[PDB]
Write an enzyme that holds these catalytic residues in place. Structure first.
Site, mmCIF file in Angstrom:
data_model
loop_
_atom_site.group_PDB
_atom_site.id
_atom_site.type_symbol
_atom_site.label_atom_id
_atom_site.label_comp_id
_atom_site.label_asym_id
_atom_site.label_seq_id
_atom_site.Cartn_x
_atom_site.Cartn_y
_atom_site.Cartn_z
ATOM 1 N N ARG A 82 0.795 -1.223 0.000
ATOM 2 C CA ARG A 82 0.000 0.000 0.000
ATOM 3 C C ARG A 82 0.819 1.260 0.000
ATOM 4 O O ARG A 82 0.312 2.288 -0.466
ATOM 5 C CB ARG A 82 -0.873 0.203 1.212
ATOM 6 N N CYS A 135 -9.668 -5.287 9.505
ATOM 7 C CA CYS A 135 -8.628 -6.261 9.563
ATOM 8 C C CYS A 135 -9.074 -7.427 10.418
ATOM 9 O O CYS A 135 -8.565 -8.534 10.278
ATOM 10 C CB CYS A 135 -7.424 -5.681 10.199
ATOM 11 N N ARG A 169 -6.945 -10.830 8.510
ATOM 12 C CA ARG A 169 -6.351 -10.964 7.193
ATOM 13 C C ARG A 169 -5.133 -10.105 6.974
ATOM 14 O O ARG A 169 -4.448 -10.324 5.986
ATOM 15 C CB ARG A 169 -7.355 -10.637 6.102
ATOM 16 N N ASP A 201 0.287 -5.810 11.356
ATOM 17 C CA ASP A 201 1.479 -5.061 11.465
ATOM 18 C C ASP A 201 2.118 -5.595 12.690
ATOM 19 O O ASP A 201 1.811 -4.982 13.731
ATOM 20 C CB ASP A 201 1.070 -3.646 11.653
ATOM 21 N N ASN A 233 -3.908 -5.463 19.223
ATOM 22 C CA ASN A 233 -4.956 -6.365 18.825
ATOM 23 C C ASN A 233 -5.022 -7.560 19.728
ATOM 24 O O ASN A 233 -6.136 -7.924 20.084
ATOM 25 C CB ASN A 233 -4.761 -6.852 17.436
HETATM 26 O O1 LIG Z 1 -5.707 -3.600 14.373
HETATM 27 C C1 LIG Z 1 -4.920 -3.468 13.416
HETATM 28 C C2 LIG Z 1 -5.245 -2.636 12.296
HETATM 29 C C3 LIG Z 1 -4.392 -2.585 11.197
HETATM 30 N N1 LIG Z 1 -3.306 -3.284 11.153
HETATM 31 C C4 LIG Z 1 -2.509 -3.035 9.954
HETATM 32 C C5 LIG Z 1 -2.530 -4.081 8.925
HETATM 33 C C6 LIG Z 1 -1.698 -3.469 7.836
HETATM 34 O O2 LIG Z 1 -0.372 -3.277 8.386
HETATM 35 C C7 LIG Z 1 -2.496 -2.191 7.728
HETATM 36 C C8 LIG Z 1 -3.842 -2.327 6.900
HETATM 37 O O3 LIG Z 1 -3.683 -2.173 5.432
HETATM 38 P P1 LIG Z 1 -4.610 -3.109 4.536
HETATM 39 O O4 LIG Z 1 -4.388 -4.442 5.171
HETATM 40 O O5 LIG Z 1 -5.977 -2.632 4.688
HETATM 41 O O6 LIG Z 1 -4.172 -3.117 3.110
HETATM 42 O O7 LIG Z 1 -2.832 -1.900 9.123
HETATM 43 C C9 LIG Z 1 -2.905 -4.109 12.174
HETATM 44 O O8 LIG Z 1 -1.929 -4.807 12.130
HETATM 45 N N2 LIG Z 1 -3.717 -4.180 13.253
#
Ligand SMILES: O=c1ccn([C@H]2C[C@H](O)[C@@H](COP(=O)(O)O)O2)c(=O)[nH]1
Ligand SMILES: O=c1ccn([C@H]2C[C@H](O)[C@@H](COP(=O)(O)O)O2)c(=O)[nH]1
Lengths: 316, 316
Positions: free
Chosen positions: B23, B198, B218, B221, B229
């Site tokens: 992204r 997520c 899915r 980070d 989380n």
């Molecule tokens: O509770 C959370 C919310 C988001 N993300 C992260 C996932 C990715 O690093 C980014 C989301 O980007 P997309 O997966 O939507 O493309 O934010 C987490 O790890 N935990």
């Protein structure tokens, strides 16, 4: 070895399962939570240790993949796997004049004057699905089932969404996308429905040039279900890849409750001494590329050299 | 040790991650597919190895749990975690007269005349969310976000479904149910939306008297997201259990892409030498039992004796 991830779940559910009550009463031993990984660039995970009729799998799948909800496609290739769901509503209906039939299920399963009536009754109906273009349309069209949750998810105001066709193309134009999911869990349709799907969600992932797929299954029958469910989604990961022109990577199967009912222990037991064999290879037709137009002969398995199959009491 | 499942994913993503585009462009190293298990009858998985402000977590959660979609609840307890999603639409709107602001994100992140304008602009807005009961209602009410996908999933013809309240009660009256899921993936709302959630799906399971919860995420980070989380859903598994009057069992966190962006390696690296400490215990208020009426003080953590925190560049 390919299928060892499977035999490790069987072993592992036995060994530290825990007796759980259930939908029938037939206990199960289950575990909550489990992932097993299959490098599909190694062979096709058809179980070698129990004969598995690929035939029922690939056609079950091509019915999913054409957006189908109709028995007839299945009966047309003697794939009977869903008949019961469909015979159910015929029997419990007001054209159906004929024997009481109130949930056969197990009333068949240990009663022979009646596990015979049902049989022809059912074949009566199968015949009637094939040949009556009108009956087939209200009693064979099954309503909501995977072909319809993947390829025509109904919307709020109108329309219907081809969830999968959309995802394949976001694989074709946005490969590194953490947002590639197809879901079958429809929350409004879930309180009042037959089998709220077991194959709840799947997700694809592309890395360095190879596809992968994960399956969340909230419920599972280690002995009857999972050998079949494993080849279904590894067939799919293979089809979707040939379509996107990708190599194959891994199939991951994540479980919620995974379980072995108890009149099946003896069987898994036996299977667990069989020494797995080399796995089959899968060639997909070299010219057809939209997978939705696929048909049986565009897919033919090689070297499946299985053990004999094993017989087992089923659901209710 | 409690959080070792976490430090094993960090280690493991480093060691066999694979560079993936993304992204932003900020690569990540990720893996597809991963489960890690936390016996919550052992302590609260707050990471000891990095200071984690529980405060933001439990209020983030109580906002989810009241069915909320409004910034104001959060700002009322200086929980800023979502402001950006909400300041976004104010700025890109036709009441907003004021500086260009076109996706700050990173235009802030390495430009100081502008990482100042934005700051007060944002605080301007925060203030305006708190105090203007009308503005707050079209710019603070955020639309679809977890409080709304869990507790008021919109239907086809009308209505709105309290998916979670329904599930807690099918925990209260049908504990051995493989069908206990709450989903946030709304397929019609997914093409055109901000962060398609997520935390896609979760599922509960009761065995022998203890609750458990699984999370399908899915995308993730490892460094910023997952420590938080992890306590969110283990807070939830704890709340829902006290409500059903159940003991606590395990929290399972199943990942799809799990990932570490690259300007964070150095940080996880450091954290990975810190020798974990004993985990905190969580006492939940002994009298309140509907959890939906819960509030901050009905939950207070004990012995969180963390290391210092670690600072890190964020998203875009
Ligand atoms: O509770 C959370 C919310 C988001 N993300 C992260 C996932 C990715 O690093 C980014 C989301 O980007 P997309 O997966 O939507 O493309 O934010 C987490 O790890 N935990
Ligand atoms: O593809 C399938 C379909 C079903 N099941 C099993 C799961 C349970 O054994 C039963 C479904 O009952 P519920 O989970 O709906 O309660 O069927 C499988 O294992 N695999």
């Amino acid at each position: 070895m390919l299928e060892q991830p499977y035999l490790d779940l069987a072993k592992k559910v036995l060994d530290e399962g825990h007796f759980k009550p259930d939908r029938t009463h037939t206990g199960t031993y289950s575990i909550f939570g489990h992932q097993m990984r299959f490098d599909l660039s190694k062979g096709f995970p058809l179980l070698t240790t129990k004969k598995v009729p690929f035939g029922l799998i690939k056609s079950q799948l091509l019915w999913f993949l054409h957006g189908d909800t109709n028995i007839r496609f299945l009966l047309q290739h003697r794939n009977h796997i869903w008949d019961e769901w469909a015979f159910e509503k015929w029997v419990k209906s007001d054209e159906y004049h004929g024997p009481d039939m109130t949930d056969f299920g197990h009333r068949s399963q240990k009663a022979p004057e009646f596990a015979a009536v049902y049989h022809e009754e059912m074949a009566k109906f199968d015949d009637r699905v094939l040949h009556d273009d009108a009956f087939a349309a209200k009693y064979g069209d099954l309503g909501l089932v995977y072909g319809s949750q993947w390829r025509a998810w109904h919307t709020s105001k109108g329309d219907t969404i081809d969830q999968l066709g959309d995802v394949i193309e976001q694989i074709k134009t946005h490969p590194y996308s953490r947002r590639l999911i197809v879901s079958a869990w429809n929350p409004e349709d879930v309180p009042t429905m037959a089998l709220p799907p077991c194959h709840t969600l799947y997700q694809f992932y592309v890395n360095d040039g190879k596809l992968s797929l994960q399956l969340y299954q909230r419920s599972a029958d280690i002995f009857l279900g999972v050998p079949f469910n494993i080849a279904s989604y590894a067939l799919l990961t293979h089809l979707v890849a040939h379509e996107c022109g990708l190599e194959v990577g891994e199939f991951i199967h994540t479980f919620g409750d995974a379980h072995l009912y108890v009149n099946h222990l003896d069987q898994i037991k036996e299977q667990l001494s069989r020494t797995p064999r080399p796995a089959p290879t899968l060639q997909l037709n070299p010219d057809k590329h939209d997978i939705f137009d696929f048909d049986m002969k565009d897919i033919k398995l090689l070297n499946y050299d299985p053990y004999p199959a094993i017989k087992a009491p089923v659901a209710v």
